[PDB]
Every structure is written in structure tokens, then in C-alpha cells.
Design a protein around this nucleic acid. Structure first.
Lengths: 58, 94, 116, 71
RNA sequence: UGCCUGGCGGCCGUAGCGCGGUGGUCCCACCUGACCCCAUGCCGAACUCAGAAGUGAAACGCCGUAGCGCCGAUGGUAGUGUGGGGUCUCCCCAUGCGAGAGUAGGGAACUGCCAGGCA
RNA sequence: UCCUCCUAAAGAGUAACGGAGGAGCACGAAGGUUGGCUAAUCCUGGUCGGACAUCAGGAGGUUAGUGCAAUGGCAUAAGCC
RNA sequence: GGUUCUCCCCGAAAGCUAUUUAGGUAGCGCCUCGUGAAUUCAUCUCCGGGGGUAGAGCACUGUUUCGGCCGAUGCAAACUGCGAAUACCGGAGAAUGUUAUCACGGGAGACACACGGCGGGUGCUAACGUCCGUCGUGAAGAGGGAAACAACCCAGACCGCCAGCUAAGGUCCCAAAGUCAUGGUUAAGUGGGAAACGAUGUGGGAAGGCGUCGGCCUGCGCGGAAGA
């Protein structure tokens, strides 16, 4: 399906283990890092879970 | 008899409800019969003014949204525990 | 309260046989007629059923309900089971007492050569 | 004017519990054994054969039953 | 293949509670007596022996009564995970999940197999 | 030394001589199994009995009980001839 | 108390069960290296779960009150005819994660943690008092902001360049940036000290009164309001 760009905006220094695992799954390593991922329900769920620190090029 | 103006709902949820309350609007629901329920939005000031008359509980309400005539009756209303403001009303089509 | 008590008392064996999941032979007794049914473990199908009312076995019986009728029903059930291959079904008394017509029917069924 | 006992469900629905596994250890009888499930003296439910676990509601009283079905 | 009756399973208040009518064709029901197989913690109470000789009393199948009871929406309400803010004891903001009760609606259930009477 | 519900934020666990007592017994029958039975509670009738020393017609179906202080589930009673 | 040369990588805890024990003894929990093994494990989506916590209700166990224990209205830690979010177990699934998962062996290290956010107990529901379950920092994390300050906010420092951008915080100078605009509030330096009472101080808002006279709510100041 259509792919989207996901970019980190805020760090995960003080975030919960679940948030850290979500960031690791997204593959974002540093603030401002951008990755390309296919749009699927699981990706949408993860991005909604960590929406407070990730921007999406819808 | 009396003319009532409302807006068709587009967003559904507690977030939309809070948006309406902040913007001085409130949602309402009309049901009754095999037809599916309709959710509408109404201004708080107009409904507060209308509620003043004692004929509200005895008169059948007429709603005109997008040029459609809907006849309903006040099945139930929701009132805040201490704030004299209206937030939701359930109506049954007659 | 008679039929309810009978059903409740039969429910004991009814549930007990369920755990072992084996075909069951049940008997319904009435002065007018006697019925015998073979029920699979699932409990929704009957392998074979016989009734004293049917003329096929009531022709040689003076009355539908009696010891002779019970013996005839037992023999018919036994031979049908033998020709169908029931493989040694268990039996339930349906809350009755195993001293009269029930005992006669059981003895008649066992006479054919069953091992229940 | 002690040591707490370990209660609760150990294996839930969908677990491939094998023969001999205890499904739940409750004080009284919270659930009743159904098919291929045995009840101990101390009101403990255990499996009798390999299979998948399920919880069902049946009966006039609407009593909860624990059952095991072939996988 | 249609109506009625009995049994074997699922469903377990959309199957229940109260009221009126109908059911003896078949089936089911009251069992009279039992000194005989059987027995009463007294009682043939239940169970077992002979049916239409006596009837549908009570029980139970069906129709209506929506009176009581149940489920049941969309919607809203109370709450909460996550980040932030405030006057920080408590509340709000963007987003996700979403109470109970009640309203519209329903139903006097439905369904699979076997035996019998009327067609 | 050990149990009984909470605080203990709907898996388990999770505090301070925490809030609470009980057991350190008993039945060798109060154990096993077969048949049948299964209320409590209240109204109405009995010489007194009125509900309360016993019996039968009802309201109601697991509110009595299950050896124990307390606790959960229990009418398929896990009770009772 | 001391334990002396340098470099690279990895990288904890101050917790859980017993003690004629409370400073210790055993193991588990946490770390490192070597070998072996499954899409093993984490995240997110869907499916099957017991929930009995929040919310509600008095049908279940109790409680105050109403007409004279009967019926009802509200309430609950040893209350649920109902019932969340959230946590947890299993099955399937696109994708990422240097296998981050598990098994064995050697080596250890630690065994008075503090503070803060979230929901409570205790405490006089006075206390910057006390103990819990979870997350973050420090312990072992440099750097920027608030005056210094560790429990506050942003942000995990391989090295170097007289490069740009940005998070929190700011744009009158000290000290780098708006003496920028839009519609207002304040007359008191309130800002820059703090809650409970009252008020001919003021801007705004919904309703009164037979041209008329007054009531209610909201934002900012005042006497209580005092640190050597």
C-alpha cells in the first residue's frame, strides 16, 4: 500500500518502556530521524500510541 | 408551528461533544420508528430561550435542517447538576 | 411433583454417562406404552427407537404395556443393535426401579447376547 | 484486639494445556468442570487430555463451566 | 407433505410470573384392590401388577391478554492510558477506549432427531 | 507455627505490635457407596398451640445448613432417613 | 585507610523468600564473557479470556431518614440482580529491532538508596510527616533554562571545524534576540507574599422593576498577609 514518512520530534529520554519499545519498532534512533514505512493498521495503531512525539507525512 | 434551526452532525465522540460545549453548541438525538437515528447540533442560547415558555412540554417540535421538515416530541432532556445549561436532548418522531 | 422428580433423578445417570461419552440405552415406561431409545454420546441423535404402540410388534401382544410387551421390545432392540453394530452400549434406568418391567426388558435384551 | 495463598487463573482460554495441568485453583467452586475436566477434593479443576480451554455459560442458573476441546 | 400428542438435544427469562378460552381422534393424566415381585422412618406417600369400567378434576400442549419481568440500540453521561497546563487537595486541553439505568424495538419463543392419531 | 475479608490501584504478589479472631482440635465415624427425600421463613386451622412443646392447607425456592471463630461455592445440595 | 601505566567494547543494584535473626549466613532478582537453540523475544492490529477496579444500584450483606417492624428515599473496607479504561495468558498477522528471547558454564559486582509524577493507607481527610504499586533523574549523564541548587523542564557528550537549524526558556540592557501588532484587565509596583470575612474601586455577561430605582456571576487590587 501507500508508504508514509515518519519523523521523530521529541526525545524518549523520560518516556515509558512501552514508548521506548514503540520507538524501537518504528526504527527512529535520534530526534529528527525520518523513516519510510508502509501504511497498515498496526503501523497506524503504533503511530497513534506515540503520536505525541512523531510526525507523519500523510 | 415554530421554526427550529440546527446543524447536521459530522463528528461523533466525547471530543466532538466537548468541542460543541466549548463553542456554545450541544448535540441532540432524534429517533423513533424503523428509520435510523439522526444526530444534530443545536445552539445553547436559542434552546435556552425556547425552554422559557411552559408550552415547550406540550407543543410538538418542528425541525428544519437542509430544508427538511421533522416532527418530534421532547422524550427526555439532560440537565447539569448545578449549571443551568442544556447539553443533550433525546426526541421521538411522532 | 412426579415427572419433575423423575427427570431430576434420571439426570444423575444422564450427566454421569456424558463424561465417558458412550452410547446409552434409555427406557420410558407408561402403562399404555413402553419406549426404548439408543442415544449417541452427543445426545442429539438416536441410533434406533422402538415403541410398544407400533403394530409390527403389537400384533402378537395382547396389550401394549405388560411384561410380555417389555420382553418383546427388549428382544427387538437387541436384534436391531446386533445388526447395526452398537458395540456394547451402556444403559440408564431413567429414574425407574429395576425390579419389574424394566428388569424384564433388560433381561430380554441381554438374552440376545449383549454385554452391557 | 502469614503467607498469602496464590489464587487466580493460571491458564486462560486458548491455552494448549496438556493432561494433568490445573486450570484454576480457587477457594470454593467459582467454575464447574465440563468436558474432559476433573474436580479434585480441594475444589481444584484440572485437565484430563490435551486440548484448548474454553469458558461457557449454560444452565437455568447461568453457571460458568470450564471445558476443553480438541485442537 | 400439513395439524395434534409423547420422548431425546441445543438455546436458558425474545423460553419466565398473573388472567380468559381450547385439548380426549391418538398420546398423556386421576388407580379403584393388592392377601400376589416391590414397601412405608405411620400411610400403596413414591414405586410395581389389570384400561376405558368411570372423566379431563389437578397437572401439562396451544391461542390471546405486553399487566409484571428481560434484552436492547445510536446518542449522551461518569471514568481512564498516553504528553502538557492550571488557582496543582482537584480540574482542563489534542487523541484512543468507553459506564449503569431509561427511551425507540422485540417477544406469551425458536430450532435438530424419533414414535403415534387425523389428513 | 498456621488460617480467615479488606486496605492492596478488576492475573499472582505488594506497609508500618494494620484493622479482626480462631486452630493448635475432633470424627476410627461426622469415611465410601445404592434408593428415596430436601427447605428456611410467614398466614390460616387444631384440647393449650397463639408462630414459638406436635400435626395439615397454603405465601415463597435455596434467606435454614456445611462439626469448628470467620470465609466461598453449594437444590445435580458439597445435606438427610 | 591505601592499592601505582594507557586504550577499545559491554555494562547493575541498594530488591524477593527463612533466622534464639535485624551488621551475616543460602538461593532467586540485576551485570559481563564463551557455547547451543526456535519469526525465540519487544512493539502494534485482530480473535478467545477470568475480571468485579472506576462508573452505577440497593435485587444480594448492612446503615441514616420519612407516614404509623411495613413500603420508600440516599449511603458502604469483611455489598453487588450490572459493569469500564487499564494489566495479564494464549492463537494469527505486514514491518523494525547487530537475537534485543531462552539453556549451560566461569567471573564477578551489590544486599541502610534519595527525590519527584501518577492512585491510596496512616496521620487531626492541619504537617516540605509516614509507608506502599508503577514511571523518570541521580546514584553511574555531560550540556541548556529557572540565581546559585539533584530530584523541576528540554536534552544521552567518539573527536575536530571563528557553520546552519531546533526542544525547554526568552527577545528593554546587563546578556543573544520584538522597546512588534491585534481586543482588553490593572492604579495597586498587584506583577514582585500567602487561603478563609466585607466592601459607594473598576471592565464584561444573563435576568428585574411601575422615563424610572436597584439586585446576581466573572477577571484584577485592599485590613488579616509576619522571617531574624
Amino acid at each position: 500500500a501507500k508508504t508514509i514518512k515518519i519523523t521523530q520530534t521529541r526525545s524518549a529520554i523520560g518516556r515509558l518502556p512501552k514508548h521506548k519499545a514503540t520507538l524501537l519498532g518504528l526504527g527512529l534512533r535520534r530526534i529528527g530521524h525520518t523513516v519510510e514505512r508502509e501504511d497498515t493498521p498496526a503501523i497506524r495503531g503504533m503511530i497513534n500510541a506515540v503520536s505525541f512525539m512523531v510526525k507523519v507525512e500523510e | 408551528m415554530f421554526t427550529i434551526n440546527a446543524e447536521v452532525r459530522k463528528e461523533q465522540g466525547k471530543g466532538a461533544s466537548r468541542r460543541l460545549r466549548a463553542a456554545n453548541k450541544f448535540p441532540a438525538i432524534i429517533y423513533g420508528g424503523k428509520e435510523a437515528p439522526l444526530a444534530i447540533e443545536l445552539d445553547h442560547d436559542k434552546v435556552m430561550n425556547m425552554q422559557a415558555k411552559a408550552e415547550f412540554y406540550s407543543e410538538v417540535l418542528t425541525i428544519v435542517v437542509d430544508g427538511k421538515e421533522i416532527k418530534v416530541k421532547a422524550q427526555d432532556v439532560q440537565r447539569h447538576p448545578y449549571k443551568p445549561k442544556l447539553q443533550h436532548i433525546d426526541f421521538v418522531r411522532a | 411433583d412426579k415427572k419433575s422428580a423423575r427427570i431430576r433423578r434420571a439426570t444423575r445417570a444422564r450427566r454421569k454417562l456424558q463424561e465417558l461419552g458412550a452410547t446409552r440405552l434409555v427406557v420410558h415406561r407408561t402403562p399404555r406404552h413402553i419406549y426404548a431409545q439408543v442415544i449417541a454420546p452427543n445426545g442429539s441423535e438416536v441410533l434406533v427407537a422402538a415403541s410398544t404402540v407400533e403394530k409390527a410388534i403389537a400384533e402378537q401382544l395382547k396389550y401394549t404395556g405388560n411384561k410380555d410387551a417389555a420382553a418383546a421390545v427388549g428382544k427387538a432392540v437387541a436384534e436391531r443393535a446386533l445388526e447395526k453394530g452398537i458395540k456394547d452400549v451402556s444403559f440408564d434406568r431413567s429414574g425407574f426401579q429395576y425390579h419389574g418391567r424394566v428388569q424384564a426388558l433388560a433381561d430380554a435384551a441381554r438374552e440376545a447376547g449383549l454385554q452391557f | 484486639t502469614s503467607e498469602a495463598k496464590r489464587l487466580g487463573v493460571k491458564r486462560f482460554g486458548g491455552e494448549s494445556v496438556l493432561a494433568g495441568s490445573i486450570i484454576v485453583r480457587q477457594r470454593g467452586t467459582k467454575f464447574h468442570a465440563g468436558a474432559n475436566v476433573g474436580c479434585g477434593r480441594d475444589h481444584t479443576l484440572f485437565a484430563k487430555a490435551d486440548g484448548k480451554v474454553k469458558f461457557e455459560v449454560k444452565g437455568p442458573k447461568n453457571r460458568k463451566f470450564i471445558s476443553i476441546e480438541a485442537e
